[PDB]
Design a protein around this ligand. Structure first.
Ligand SMILES: *[C@H]1O[C@H](CO)[C@@H](O[C@H]2O[C@H](CO)[C@@H](O[C@H]3O[C@H](CO)[C@@H](O)[C@H](O)[C@@H]3O)[C@H](O)[C@H]2NC(C)=O)[C@H](O)[C@H]1NC(C)=O
Length: 361
């Protein structure tokens, strides 16, 4: 079983214990660690943070302790304009340029592969996305002729049915990618004013429309569209989503006035690190959707949708029963990496939970 874990560059600037460097990663925790977000300049892959070269090296030294540990660098991300991506892949001239620039880069800094994080291609992009993948794999296959281990090529893909139909040719790209990460944790849409869970496992016998907004459907749809189970990786969130209640109503469907207040270390409205959530829980009321098998908490006018050890284990069991390749965890820096916030002196409680399920078979 694979266990793909993302590490984000910007988590280093977090104050106090929130600060996280590659240093804190247990080399034996995951099978692959993806460094989050390289950038693109003059149609060529490039660094983002001033000290990326130092961090790249810090991350890749973990491989000295765990010889089997694979690392990848990811291009794109949320702060990377989809248009910029769209622009690079349409013109075969800039595409080939971008492509040829990658292997040397990755080889210089010690990466075993590239992760494509084109955050949401549109209807006019499908054709070009396919081209990018086809050609990149071809270039990688070629570079291996030089006597070295072929570079890996993966991609983070949307879990929403509409987004999927619109910009992805799943059948095509699947035969060229090494593994696909399903972003099964962006289900509750930031568009409108209601309380809801962003990473439900099941549909839940309790609301007819938007049966497409749960991991179960997402996985079944990908399999239907032709992606091999042995290449699909289900994404599991290590963070939670917060909301500011617009009323004293706390149950499903309650009115929302806006995102929840930021966390001490995370500092972003509407998001909270799992370790921030462990602190929040004190004096909070815990609930759990039985149909969807995920929890949520409320305190004052703040409403939080998150994942605990049990929900995460549940998702992992599901993942194993459908016979998927593994799990993907978004942000090791959002889990309790120090292991000092969430009671149990355990390090990486959430990621460890997934690993336990993947490991007992
Ligand atoms: C990776 O990706 C981008 C593309 O290379 C980097 O970017 C910007 O690139 C330069 C750097 O500041 C900007 O500014 C010059 O030109 C603009 C007009 O384009 C002038 O107005 C400005 O005064 C500068 O002379 C570009 O505007 C901007 N380009 C794009 C496409 O966004 C980007 O910096 C990088 N990594 C990071 C750290 O974000």
């Amino acid at each position: 079983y694979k266990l793909i874990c993302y590490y984000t560059s910007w988590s280093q600037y977090r104050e106090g214990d929130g600060s996280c460097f590659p240093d804190a990663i247990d080399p034996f925790l995951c099978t692959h660690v993806i460094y989050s977000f390289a950038n693109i300049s003059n149609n060529e892959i490039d660094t983002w943070e001033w000290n990326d070269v130092t961090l790249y090296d810090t991350l890749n030294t973990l491989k000295n302790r765990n010889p089997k540990l694979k690392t990848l660098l990811s291009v794109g991300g949320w702060n990377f304009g989809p248009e910029r991506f769209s622009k690079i892949a349409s013109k075969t001239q800039s595409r080939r340029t971008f492509i040829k620039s990658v292997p040397p880069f990755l080889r210089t800094h010690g990466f075993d592969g590239l992760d494509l994080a084109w955050l949401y291609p549109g209807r006019r992009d499908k054709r070009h996305l396919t081209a990018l993948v086809k050609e990149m794999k071809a270039e990688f296959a070629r570079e291996a002729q030089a006597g070295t281990e072929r570079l890996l090529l993966s991609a983070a893909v949307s879990a929403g049915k509409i987004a999927i139909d619109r910009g992805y040719d799943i059948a095509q790209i699947s035969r060229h990618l090494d593994f696909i990460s399903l972003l099964t944790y962006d289900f509750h849409g930031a568009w409108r004013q209601t309380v809801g869970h962003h990473s439900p496992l099941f549909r839940g016998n309790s609301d007819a429309s938007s049966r497409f907004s749960n991991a179960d459907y997402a996985v079944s749809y990908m399999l239907r569209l032709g992606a091999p189970a042995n290449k699909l990786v289900m994404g599991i969130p290590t963070f939670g989503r917060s909301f500011t209640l617009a009323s004293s109503k706390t149950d499903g469907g309650a009115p929302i006035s806006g995102p929840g207040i930021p966390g001490r270390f995370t500092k972003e409205k509407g998001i909270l690190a799992y370790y921030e959530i462990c602190d929040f829980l004190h004096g909070a009321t815990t609930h759990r959707f039985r149909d969807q098998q995920v929890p949520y908490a409320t305190k004052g006018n703040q409403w939080v949708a998150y994942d605990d050890q049990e929900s995460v284990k549940n998702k992992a069991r599901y993942l194993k029963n459908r016979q998927l390749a593994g799990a993907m965890v978004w942000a090791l820096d959002l889990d309790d990496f120090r292991g000092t916030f969430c009671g149990q002196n355990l390090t990486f409680p959430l990621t460890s939970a997934v690993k336990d399920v993947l490991a007992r078979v």
